[PDB]
Amino acid sequence: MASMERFLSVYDEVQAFLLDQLQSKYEIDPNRARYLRIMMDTTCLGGKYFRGMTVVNVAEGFLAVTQHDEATKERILHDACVGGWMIEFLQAHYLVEDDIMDGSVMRRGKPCWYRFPGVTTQCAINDGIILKSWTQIMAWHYFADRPFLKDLLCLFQKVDYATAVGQMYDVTSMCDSNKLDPEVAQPMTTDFAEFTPAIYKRIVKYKTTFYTYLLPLVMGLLVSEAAASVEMNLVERVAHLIGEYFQVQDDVMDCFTPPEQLGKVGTDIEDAKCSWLAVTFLGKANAAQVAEFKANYGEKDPAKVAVVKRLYSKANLQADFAAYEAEVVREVESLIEQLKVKSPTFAESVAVVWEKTHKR
Amino acid sequence: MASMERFLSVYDEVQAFLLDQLQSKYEIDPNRARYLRIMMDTTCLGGKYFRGMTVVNVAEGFLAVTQHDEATKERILHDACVGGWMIEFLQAHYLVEDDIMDGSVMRRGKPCWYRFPGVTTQCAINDGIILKSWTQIMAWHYFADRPFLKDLLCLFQKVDYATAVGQMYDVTSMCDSNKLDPEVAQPMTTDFAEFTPAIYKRIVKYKTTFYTYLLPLVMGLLVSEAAASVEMNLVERVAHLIGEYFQVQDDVMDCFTPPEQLGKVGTDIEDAKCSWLAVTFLGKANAAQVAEFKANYGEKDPAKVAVVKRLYSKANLQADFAAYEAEVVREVESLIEQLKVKSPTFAESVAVVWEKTHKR
Ligand SMILES: Fc1ccc(Cn2cnc3ccccc32)cc1
Ligand SMILES: Fc1ccc(Cn2cnc3ccccc32)cc1
Incomplete structure (x- = not known):
């Protein structure tokens, strides 16, 4: 059975489980259950499922080199799909709350959840809370007697904390x-x-790499009972490295990818974000260029924003980007090699993660 | 050592632990650590510590009838203080986020956290997230090898979920x-x-009783290793009953306790809340009174609000309140008696919880 189809089947299953439990154990009515069903769909679905599919993909790699009964294979794949949904739902929580925090307008070519007419910030803040709470409900129900339950919960806690810390670093930057x-x-x-x-x-x-790369690779390991096939310091290093590269890309696209392709109007320059572009620009600027940057950055006035994008184009940041990219390729391929010492299988899953990231 | 002093000592201890761990394991700088220290103080301190002290009080009752080494007593008391802080911090999370959601102005005679000049909603939403995340950090660190860790985490998850559900019921009411x-x-x-x-x-x-009464009584039981001294259905029933009574009181005070004593300006009537007063008023109203209620409820115009408070006073809701109170007293004393069958000790802790609630 193909992994993506499995993953989507499991969404349906989990959705039905969470809503049935709201009716049997939390006294929910049919209309509020409907509201939460639509919220879950609108906040968790419509992306590429990169996070959650990485859990599956890692697990599928171990299955290919590890003897199991067929029923055990299925159990492992199911666990990987649940675990991947935990991470999708965690991301949904963070996207909902960060949109609200950041005064965001669109996400993926649609309005941010808090902006839907029948939602509002009053509901959306709580909807985001519920999104995260569903991650735990998933774990407690589907992993209740699993040997990895402790470790998974503990890791998930740390990842989520690290992420909240990253938001604090990002919005105060x-x-x-x-x-x-x-x-x-x-x-x-x-x-x-x-x-x-x-x-x-x-x-x-902190803002991205713990939940986007670290948690999907290690959750794959955990559902596979395969923590011993890796040197977890290598996994952390490669996770943090690939994830940095993912974010730099995101920063570039905010400024230069047309809104229709981006799915939203980028406002990093207006919001004065500590972006890759701003840091790199300042890394190479002469006195006049710095002064012009400071006179225009972090201002909503579109003329000021255009002055900032000109500075970026004129500073040929493409070249610094290629150099950065080249180093990252170098350092990722290195880390993969170190990972092959304990697990060619796990190394190959990292290689796939790297390809999907490096190309999009 | 007196329980309140112990409880406060443990706050200091936990605060220092969480901030030191941010420095050693999450790369925090001294100024953002300072911001989180002030946030923790401003959001977690200054109430009566009823929730968290109930955990302690329950544990102290079992210690009086149970043989232990002195070091075990201390361990249990410490655990109870940690556990009580978990609940204080959960409440702080909910107060922060619900203030933001509800457009609240003051809390305890001070501005709501999101309204502090150097906070804003952008930071406060995340600060509230961190507040909850600290509850888990506390548990994982201080209860790592405890036999109750699984049960405590699982209960805490359910309580928190039930609470988020209650907010959804409250703001859509x-x-x-x-x-x-x-x-x-x-x-x-x-x-x-x-x-x-x-x-x-x-x-x-859902909105209040799970975290305010259920969780402090059962966490007391858990740190005490005393779940077997109770019929958990009785505990749930009494928790939900006392907590209802607590909320009805809160509803009355929103409308009738002068702002200076209340600590805030009550706006239930303007916000169209499904309050005890509104439900009871409608329970006894004639046609004209209902019609006048509907023409004035849920409107910010102070004249409309005054029309609603007149309707309340003129409907002599005091009498319905005494009757309700009388029934609750009856049903609480009954539940306490059923609890004495397995534990006079635990029954007495419930009796104290009831006294503190019934008088304030
Ligand atoms: F997902 C994560 C993975 C590693 C770390 C950093 N870290 C390293 N050792 C730790 C012990 C307790 C707490 C954090 C810790 C944070 C989040
Ligand atoms: F803190 C709580 C205590 C009891 C309940 C209600 N309940 C009863 N049995 C349950 C099984 C799974 C999930 C919820 C459950 C909710 C929250």
């Missing part, structure tokens, strides 16, 4: 750290001293 | 259920057909 203060309204950085490669690396490591 | 629809902006009920005792009971059961 345009403020001077020494002036953070709940009591005082926060000014934008005027010096941009904290727009550095190391700082940017921290933002991106 | 003034909409006709058949017209819930993410696609369509939601009108206020014109008939108020769903302002019934059974519906109201559902809202309040």
